[PDB]
Design a protein around this ligand. Sequence first.
Ligand SMILES: [Mg+2]
Length: 740
Amino acid sequence: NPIHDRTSDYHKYLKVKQGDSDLFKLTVSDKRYIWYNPDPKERDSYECGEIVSETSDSFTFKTVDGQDRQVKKDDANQRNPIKFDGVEDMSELSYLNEPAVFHNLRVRYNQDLIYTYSGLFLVAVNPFKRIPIYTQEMVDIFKGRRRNEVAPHIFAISDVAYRSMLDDRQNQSLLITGESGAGKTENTKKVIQYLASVAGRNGVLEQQILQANPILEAFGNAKTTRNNNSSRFGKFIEIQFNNAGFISGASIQSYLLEKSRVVFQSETERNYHIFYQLLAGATAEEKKALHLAGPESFNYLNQSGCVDIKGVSDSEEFKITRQAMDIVGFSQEEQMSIFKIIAGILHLGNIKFEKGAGEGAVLKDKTALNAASTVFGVNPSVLEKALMEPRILAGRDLVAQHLNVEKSSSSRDALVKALYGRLFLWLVKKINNVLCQERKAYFIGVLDISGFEIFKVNSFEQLCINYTNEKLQQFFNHHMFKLEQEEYLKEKINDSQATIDLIDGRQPPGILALLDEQSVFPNATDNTLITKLHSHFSKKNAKYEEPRFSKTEFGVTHYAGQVMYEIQDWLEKNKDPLQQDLELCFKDSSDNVVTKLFNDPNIASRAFITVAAQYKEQLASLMATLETTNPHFVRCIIPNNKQLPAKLEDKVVLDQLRCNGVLEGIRITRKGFPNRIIYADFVKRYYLLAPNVPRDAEDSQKATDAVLKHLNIDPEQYRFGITKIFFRAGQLARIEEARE
Ligand SMILES: [Mg+2]
């Protein structure tokens, strides 16, 4: 049993190394330390100072350089005794302050232990290097093991959820959030791998479920400056089981796909993988039929300066993508058309509009336009007209307008984005057709979405994702509350709304409601909207802030701190408009897939309700599902902003812990009886402290109370529970600090 064999990879890779002795005496020391900021020239930077003296109210300690510093006891960030360095659950720490928390994580990370629990959370820190802990052999060890029985691991929580499902006959969910590059998708792939193995039918389905993700990653992921394989969409995966606990199906819900990346990428960034995949991967024959060329030949791929990802073979990836498509069930016809769509979008992007003639646009050369039409299976003349001379309703009149270049290009871009987003939707729907079962007994759903987003510039998409995160954090908060009460009961012992409403309130109206309102008027502008927003909430709603000088931004006080959003283009983003003429053009496509994107109301349209109203609706459905499950929380954290291993940056790390709810949870916990130990566990270690108790007594509680009594500990500091002894913050450390 690798769990008992100190020489296994299980041991090397997932546990703190254990030597011969276990004895208390080993960790004994006179030294008491404190965590201090060697400079409030930082604040996540701390150093360990050794208390060299104390007064009845403050401590005095030496710095690294040797300087004596003084601290208020009540302000001291006491260092936990050495024995706690490395614990698998932060809930086991006696002193729960921030630096203390960061220290435990760091000690673990330094040994390549990337997983650590924090109470109900599993904290996962990207190592930025491959650690061989996800082999079948590792899968096996986690089978049927309790949380307390094995090292922290994504497989562990996956197991705990599968067992809960079977035992409680209750659906479950794993919410995996955090920053781009944190490891959400990776951990999500592991959850599914684990499940397919512990519950799979020793298989076509399983194979299909597994191959679905590669398909979706090809079309929804792209290299960004934060992740070579960034998910540009969020997702909720339902892994479906029958009542015997075998995988019976699956479903995928996608959200907020970044359609704009199709038409623009920042420097060093890439468009979606697929484009590169098809271009590298297509057969010298397919190219001819697709009018393909190198990336440098396409405006949609030649602006960023990066057409390739280090250590990635687009051609090889294409092969994997086509394979998945085959496994899942996409017909080669269907497959050709998908590629046609990709090709077509690239041709659309190579369309150059020119002026002069007047103020209106024209197409001198039509090669691009033609290539695009050929691939799409639409009429080039119909296309050309719909782009530059769409018929617009003037109330009674339906008159064609001659758009200028700008407007013309914008339109083209809109066409591309609609094509891309609809295609994606269609892909999801197709995958669901194959995988999904209307006949499921139970499910375990996985949500892999970003956590709060606070960038240099925050826009409509950020507001959406942050709104979701306010709801998830509040979901967490409510849950922690139940679970903690429960705990206390079992042993016999003792702001989101406001932000939420500001955003999605109906009466008085919140941001999205005012946004929808403005959305009804053709002539509204960025300025009309922001003024309206300030009008309703500036100095009037406590979570809102009108800026001192900017005229195009506004701030929302979020759980994670204030976020400033800029309003540019919000009206447009809310309506996501597409000229009706273009809809007409495409509805007549001779392509089999194309036609679905424009003639299936479930793909071609929202309801119509705005983008905001749809987002709010989708989010409420999601929450509603979640509410029916037993949830599990994984907070993935990036160690630094450079994608490097062995470089865990305190400020980078603490800031994520402040935003993702881990430190708040601990704050909450630290206040009561953070430490809770099984009687026998206590004696096993502390027996030697009292002139009385036998390491292995049969009256474990008594035994406990014995030691306690010996030590004259303050009764207020602990609580006799049915199966464990509950200890207030710090108590346990002092106990540990006790002479034998
Ligand atoms: Mg991801």
